[PDB]
Amino acid sequence: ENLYFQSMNLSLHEYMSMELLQEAGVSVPKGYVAKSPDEAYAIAKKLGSKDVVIKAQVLAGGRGKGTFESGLKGGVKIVFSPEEAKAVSSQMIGKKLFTKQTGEKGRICNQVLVCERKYPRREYYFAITMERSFQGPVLIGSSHGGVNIEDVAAESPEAIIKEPIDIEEGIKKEQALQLAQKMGFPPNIVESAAENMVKLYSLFLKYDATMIEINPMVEDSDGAVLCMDAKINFDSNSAYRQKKIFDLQDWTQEDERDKDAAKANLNYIGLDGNIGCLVNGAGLAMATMDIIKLHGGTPANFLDVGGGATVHQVTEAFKLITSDKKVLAILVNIFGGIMRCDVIAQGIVMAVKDLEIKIPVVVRLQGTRVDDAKALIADSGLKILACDDLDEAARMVVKLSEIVTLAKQAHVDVKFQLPI
Amino acid sequence: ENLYFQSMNLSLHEYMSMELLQEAGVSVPKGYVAKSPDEAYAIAKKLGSKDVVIKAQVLAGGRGKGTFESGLKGGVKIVFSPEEAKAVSSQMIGKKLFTKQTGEKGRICNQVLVCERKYPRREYYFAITMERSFQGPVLIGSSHGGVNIEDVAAESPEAIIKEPIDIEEGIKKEQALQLAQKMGFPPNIVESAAENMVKLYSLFLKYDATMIEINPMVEDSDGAVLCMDAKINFDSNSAYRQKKIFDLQDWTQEDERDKDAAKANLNYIGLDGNIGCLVNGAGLAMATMDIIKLHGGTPANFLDVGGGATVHQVTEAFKLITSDKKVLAILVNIFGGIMRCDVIAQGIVMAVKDLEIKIPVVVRLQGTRVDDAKALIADSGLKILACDDLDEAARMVVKLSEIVTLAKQAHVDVKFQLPI
Amino acid sequence: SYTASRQHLYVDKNTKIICQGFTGKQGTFHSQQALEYGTKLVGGTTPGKGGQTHLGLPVFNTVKEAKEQTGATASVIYVPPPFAAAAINEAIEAEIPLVVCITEGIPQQDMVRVKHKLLRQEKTRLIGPNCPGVINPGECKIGIMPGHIHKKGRIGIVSRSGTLTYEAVHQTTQVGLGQSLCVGIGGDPFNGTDFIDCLEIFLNDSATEGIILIGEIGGNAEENAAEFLKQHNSGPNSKPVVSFIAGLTAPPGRRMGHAGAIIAGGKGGAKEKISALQSAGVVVSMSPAQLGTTIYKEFEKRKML
Numbered sequence A, B: 001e002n003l004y005f006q007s008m009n010l011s012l013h014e015y016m017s018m019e020l021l022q023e024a025g026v027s028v029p030k031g032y033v034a035k036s037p038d039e040a041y042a043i044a045k046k047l048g049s050k051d052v053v054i055k056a057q058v059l060a061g062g063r064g065k066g067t068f069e070s071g072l073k074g075g076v077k078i079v080f081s082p083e084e085a086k087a088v089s090s091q092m093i094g095k096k097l098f099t100k101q102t103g104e105k106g107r108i109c110n111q112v113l114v115c116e117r118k119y120p121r122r123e124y125y126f127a128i129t130m131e132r133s134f135q136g137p138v139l140i141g142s143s144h145g146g147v148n149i150e151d152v153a154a155e156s157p158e159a160i161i162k163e164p165i166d167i168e169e170g171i172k173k174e175q176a177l178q179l180a181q182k183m184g185f186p187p188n189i190v191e192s193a194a195e196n197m198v199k200l201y202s203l204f205l206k207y208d209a210t211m212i213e214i215n216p217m218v219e220d221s222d223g224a225v226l227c228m229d230a231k232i233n234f235d236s237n238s239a240y241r242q243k244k245i246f247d248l249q250d251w252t253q254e255d256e257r258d259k260d261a262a263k264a265n266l267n268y269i270g271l272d273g274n275i276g277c278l279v280n281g282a283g284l285a286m287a288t289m290d291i292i293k294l295h296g297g298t299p300a301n302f303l304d305v306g307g308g309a310t311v312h313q314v315t316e317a318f319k320l321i322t323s324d325k326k327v328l329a330i331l332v333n334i335f336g337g338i339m340r341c342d343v344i345a346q347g348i349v350m351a352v353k354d355l356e357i358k359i360p361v362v363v364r365l366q367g368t369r370v371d372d373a374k375a376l377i378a379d380s381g382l383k384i385l386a387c388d389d390l391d392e393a394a395r396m397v398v399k400l401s402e403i404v405t406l407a408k409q410a411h412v413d414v415k416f417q418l419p420i
Numbered sequence C: 001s002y003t004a005s006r007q008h009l010y011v012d013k014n015t016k017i018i019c020q021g022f023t024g025k026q027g028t029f030h031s032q033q034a035l036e037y038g039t040k041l042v043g044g045t046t047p048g049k050g051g052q053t054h055l056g057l058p059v060f061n062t063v064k065e066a067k068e069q070t071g072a073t074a075s076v077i078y079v080p081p082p083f084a085a086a087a088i089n090e091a092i093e094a095e096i097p098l099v100v101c102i103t104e105g106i107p108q109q110d111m112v113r114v115k116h117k118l119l120r121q122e123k124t125r126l127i128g129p130n131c132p133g134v135i136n137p138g139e140c141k142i143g144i145m146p147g148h149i150h151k152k153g154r155i156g157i158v159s160r161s162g163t164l165t166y167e168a169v170h171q172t173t174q175v176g177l178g179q180s181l182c183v184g185i186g187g188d189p190f191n192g193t194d195f196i197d198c199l200e201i202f203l204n205d206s207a208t209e210g211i212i213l214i215g216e217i218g219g220n221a222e223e224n225a226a227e228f229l230k231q232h233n234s235g236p237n238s239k240p241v242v243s244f245i246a247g248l249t250a251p252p253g254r255r256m257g258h259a260g261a262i263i264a265g266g267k268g269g270a271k272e273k274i275s276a277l278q279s280a281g282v283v284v285s286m287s288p289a290q291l292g293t294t295i296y297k298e299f300e301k302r303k304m305l
Ligand SMILES: CC(C)(COP(=O)(O)OP(=O)(O)OC[C@H]1O[C@@H](n2cnc3c(N)ncnc32)[C@H](O)[C@@H]1OP(=O)(O)O)[C@@H](O)C(=O)NCCC(=O)NCCS
Pocket: A306, A307, A308, A338, C020, C021, C022, C023, C024, C025, C026, C027, C045, C046, C047, C077, C078, C079, C080, C081, C083, C086, C087, C102, C103, C104, C105, C130, C131, C132, C144, C162
């Protein structure tokens, strides 16, 4: 489901997206960022010392059901005095949040968002998303905000209004009024909704975004609709020309291995197995995972070197797989194409020679240079276990993983070589 | 768990308790009762034709998760115009609500409650309950209203403040201020909370109530704390001197068999088995259920004739068990005591003779008159299957139920008599 | 409609090809490989460095000049991802009968801008981006593909992931069934070619008797292909088709946000895809290691061998 394997789209913390909406002129509750209880106190007394909401800036699927190490329920709190605001913030900042998505490797709440608490009258869901069905941006709107939207979309497909937009002519205000009036806005604040949607679409086109979800867009108790949440999924490919947004990327929310892989343009996918891999292209990565799971194995943490990567890239790759200790047997399964196989053969030679890779490297190299790669493998004269059949390679690597974990139990050492 | 077997405490519909709080002077949102969409329209336009809440008056454990036959989710709705108020009310009034407690025999929503919608700022739980631990009324208060209270009470026992009250000296306002300030009321509306608690306690003592639960007692966005829900569990024994409250009892919420049983002072307990009973006292009723379940049977619908009931009472009882068709074998298991066993022997004689009770009546009569009862049973000369051992009686009745359901399958008729 | 260019996919041995971004590293190397294979490369285009002779063939400042000097009927693209959208716009403006762009990393918005004007035109067919390329075995290869495993035969392969496309190519060549046309539409959601075009080009072609259909989780193109094959490849005289679904066993996902993910989609990319595949008469494989054996078994079952 979803993509997962292909790219990890940049998700910002809540306060960054809230600031982005603020600078764009979108109507928004007053909000600030707190790194310590002291400025939390300062902002709480600045907003009136009463009726304040505190939100945790943690990137996870579960944020209201998570648990802190201090023993607090959820990531959102409602405080009514700056003193209790400091008290609750002292239990969030510097604390590790345990949610079901993390399980046990929870992310740490570095900052918090301090906002004014506003009472919503009606709850609308809204979302500007790029999509292939309508060959472009789509404005989705509904009057079922504040609640999970997939359930009502599946049970009541009519209630989810979807309107496409023509990109070359841009967005027209009449379209925004049409969407607002089809959702069911009050006839006195439709203009504000149209202005908010126009500003949101301008932000959507400017920052190279992919999906701006406002859930829920809520009318206040005194009109002047205000957005509550501003989830933004950006585009990974837009790193080259969107420097401001991508520089603010939070790196604490991912493993240091992920950061190192991204430093060299290598996709990384960790897992719960004990058979490392090194695969060219996501498709053959899922293929390798499926074929390993067929033979009773389970991949541990496998990579994706992209196309045209240098030898240093695959050297860093092998460093990255060998960094994890849960790995037992590594297979480099790269078929040829854009990624010139000879540089991978050179990279395996260099990486096995340097980092002392004693684990069984079940290589399987093909494509656009087979003579050079195999010739280099034979010239290097190592335990580089050559193979040339995908099913045979998977069988061999799974059996080698079992052999390694068995010999570790037996407290004996083994060395693997091709049959004569 | 709970009591269930012993007495069904009178639970009023929401609007009746809301009116009772209104007449007592307790601060309360404006509310009215609607029996048809027309007066729903009238009240909606009376309250401002906007920001209105509609509640279903159904006595069940599940009210926000139930389903109507029309296909609406939950018993609460938020309407913003009288027209949509009429539209939603047309899908509630006269409709049958399906909740997990009912399963399939859902109660019918006869009326609805139309109320003004108010935005709560803080949510407090509060409850005046009679209890044996503190030998009287107890004021329970907490700042975790709007959410199920057992979970937070078990996980955080400190947060649930409990204060007992001395009945002869009544309740003192200083006690109400103490409770309000220990819950954490704002220091400007503590007086209003104390007045509300004093009025609620006066109502509690007046109407012979047992448990008045306000959940959640909420401060409004402009002070002047207002109660949202006003659950009231009354006292069954107080029927003689509380005529106004007990006359307003809704009888549609229970089976007609329950109404008929209550018309003659007979406790009734329906079940999902096929062995009817007729038991004196709740304790021996649970004893009979346990002993029947021991032998693989399952009681169908068993009664409790109380003490000193007339022969007409047990005649109506036998009419009531025989009314249900799911019953196969009936055991009258009355031990002596207050309930003079000879009148039960006369009642079985009369009821078997009159209603043509062809099902096996596994009687077991003892206590304070055994000679008269057995003599009358022998004189009547019927299939009144006498027994005198509790375990033997349960064995006999379970086997007779199996025999009856087997002969029904075989399409043959049987007659049961004592061994010679 | 733009769909009228579907027949442009099947290039023959008389297809003149130009290569934009000729001097680029990958461009130079794979131009060498294509020339070694036998592709009728007739020049390249590089902005600001054209008008010269490189690799023994002319290079120009724009595709306009290449078209007016040689009349090439197809183009391939290797310009950097920052400038790829402009190159594709220029290629479509020059009325290139078949343009394929290989680059990966193109911003979604620029690809939207490209795809819109591509759909408002009927005389240009685009393959990519993030695609392996298009090959007619033994005749002409375009893009990035190891021609040294290709032999003309009776198998048509279309797939999203280029690397698994190569895997299927190799597993069909090993059993000796050959290949008729192998196309990688590319995994990018905003691409110039989809399943329907390749499937119906394969169906109405006599040179192809078996179709290979590898798809990955995510998206709903496989459901559209299943519906199309139910509509037009049912009953008698229906050439067999074998499919694989990469990622059948995979972690549930990330579940970052709603809307474009599931709300307006067909919530596909799971165990329900393969069901839509059997329901359309498509034979599925349970592992990416036996596609060639599966298609051989399908041919021998129907007795085409
Ligand atoms: C396509 C790709 C190979 C091009 O980049 P590269 O070859 O690594 O690097 P280059 O700098 O040579 O690429 C740009 C070249 O085109 C030239 N160029 C500039 N503007 C151009 C334009 N509008 N059109 C074409 N070429 C252009 C550049 O001058 C440069 O030539 P040069 O190196 O002689 O200066 C690269 O982007 C890539 O990685 N491929 C696409 C995605 C991928 O990972 N591979 C295929 C995925 S299956």
